[PDB]
Amino acid sequence: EVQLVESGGGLVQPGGSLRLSCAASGGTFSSIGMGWFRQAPGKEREFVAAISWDGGATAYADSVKGRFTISADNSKNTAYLQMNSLKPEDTAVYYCAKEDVGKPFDWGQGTLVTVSSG
Amino acid sequence: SNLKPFERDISTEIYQAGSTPCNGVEGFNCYFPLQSYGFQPTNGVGYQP
Numbered sequence A: 001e002v003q004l005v006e007s008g009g010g011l012v013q014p015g016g017s018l019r020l021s022c023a024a025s026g027g028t029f030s031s032i033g034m035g036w037f038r039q040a041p042g043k044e045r046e047f048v049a050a051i052s053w054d055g056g057a058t059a060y061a062d063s064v065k066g067r068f069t070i071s072a073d074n075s076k077n078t079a080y081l082q083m084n085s086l087k088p089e090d091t092a093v094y095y096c097a098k099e100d101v102g103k104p105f106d107w108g109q110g111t112l113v114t115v116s117s118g
Numbered sequence B: 001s002n003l004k005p006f007e008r009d010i011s012t013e014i015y016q017a018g019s020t021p022c023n024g025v026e027g028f029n030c031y032f033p034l035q036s037y038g039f040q041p042t043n044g045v046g047y048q049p
Helices: none
Strands: A004-007 A019-024 A035-039 A045-051 A058-060 A069-073 A078-082 A092-097 A111-115
Touching: A004 A092, A019 A092, A045 A069, A058 A069, A092 A111
Parallel strands: none
Antiparallel strands: A004 A019, A019 A078, A035 A045, A035 A092, A045 A058, A069 A078
């Protein structure tokens, strides 16, 4: 069922930096619309960023410009997400999706990411 | 694809990367106009442009 393993989710101090990673269980070894989506509390799903498997194209949302960096590895078949200077509003559950050619949207379990000074 | 050999190209904007159109705004299903070159001073002998 297009298994997608996630890692890196955890607690972080305000304005911190984490090391997130998502790996796909094969997924035809070819994707066209891979991207990261999140669901914030009391809010709905929205776009964050998207990167291309066949090339180095990287797409980022308005609020994640520059600070966030996304890269995909063709050898290990996984995506590494790195970021810096997070804000309290960033608290939300992330998800990594692999869009296959001419097929519906695939999704994974995701991880819980929380930022606060507690 | 392999278009007319003699011609001038000034294309730009994502070429319908995803199902949804770019809608004139970058983001998902949208790619940068041109990927960046930038070989280093010493990166492979027979690899420089």
